Structure 1
Amino acid sequence: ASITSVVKTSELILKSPLLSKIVVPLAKTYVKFSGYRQLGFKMNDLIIEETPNMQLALRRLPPTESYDRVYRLIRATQFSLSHKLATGNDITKPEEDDHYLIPYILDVEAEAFEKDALDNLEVV
């Protein structure tokens, strides 16, 4: 699935009052049980990157964001191999779990999908 898809569906849910009332609390619990914050990751660090679109989005990260992501990946890898969890400031707090990558990938995919559409235009 494309990030575009995921974001659009999420926005449909967040619009509907009923839907958001039942989905938002579930989603927050899911994230708590997922436990990626206990390895000091932000959610976007987990997105599959071995794709042309994602490699292009990662190249467009500002250098600071890019250097910080590299450190979180190395740090999480060291927790993984040691079978330890983050403690203290290494744990990602909910307020730090920012969608730093989502805007870049949405722009990459926007162009990719427009190109697909326009490759199939029919002069009327």
Structure 2
Amino acid sequence: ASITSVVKTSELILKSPLLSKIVVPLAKTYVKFSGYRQLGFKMNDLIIEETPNMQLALRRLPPTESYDRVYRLIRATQFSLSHKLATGNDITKPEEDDHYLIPYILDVEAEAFEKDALDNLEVV
């Protein structure tokens, strides 16, 4: 699935009061049990990156965000191989779990999808 799809569907849910009332609490528990924060990751660090679109989005990250992402991946790799969890300031707090990459990938995909549409235009 594309990030665009995921973001649009999520926005439909967040709009509907009923839907948000039942989905948002579930999503928060899901994230707590997921446990990626206990390896010091942010949610966006987990997104598959071996695609042209994602490689382009990663290249457009500001240098500081890019250097920090590299460190979180290396740190999480070291927790994984040691069979340990983060402690203290290495644990990602909910307020630090920012969607740093989502705006870049949504722009890359917007152009990619517009290009696909425009490749199929028919002069009326």
Scaled by the length of structure 1, the TM-score of the pair is: 1.00
Query: Cα offset for 1:22?
Result: 0.0
Tell me the distance in 1 between the aligned counterparts of 2:38 and 2:5. Answer: 27
How far the C-alpha of 1:105 sits from its partner, in A, is 0.0
Partners in 1 of 2:121 and 2:37 — Cα distance?
45
State the shift of 1:85 in Å: 0.1
Per the TM alignment, residue 21 of structure 1 is displaced from its structure 2 partner at its CA by: 0.0
Question: How many angstroms apart in 2 are the aligned matches of 1:11 and 1:107?
Answer: 17
3-state secondary structure, aligned to 1:6: helix
Deviation of the 1:48 alpha carbon: 0.0
State the shift of 1:65 in Å: 0.0
Q: How far is 1:41 from its partner?
A: 0.0
TM-score (norm 2): 1.00
The structural deviation recorded for 1:98 is 0.0
Question: Gaps (5+ residues) in structure 2?
Answer: none
What is the CA RMSD across the aligned residues, in angstroms? 0.0
**SS state at 2:99 partner:** coil
Residue pairs, 1:18-57, within 5 angstroms: 18-57=18-57
Q: CA deviation at 1:35?
A: 0.0
Q: Give the Cα–Cα distance (whole angstroms) in 1 for the partners of residues 76 and 89 of structure 2.
A: 13
Q: How many angstroms does 1:104 deviate by?
A: 0.1
Over the matched positions of the two proteins, sequence identity in percent amounts to 100
Q: Distance in 2 between the 1:81 and 1:16 partners? A: 43
Partner of 2:99: 99
Greater than 6 Å deviation, 4+ residue runs: none
Per-residue deviation, 1:3 = 0.0
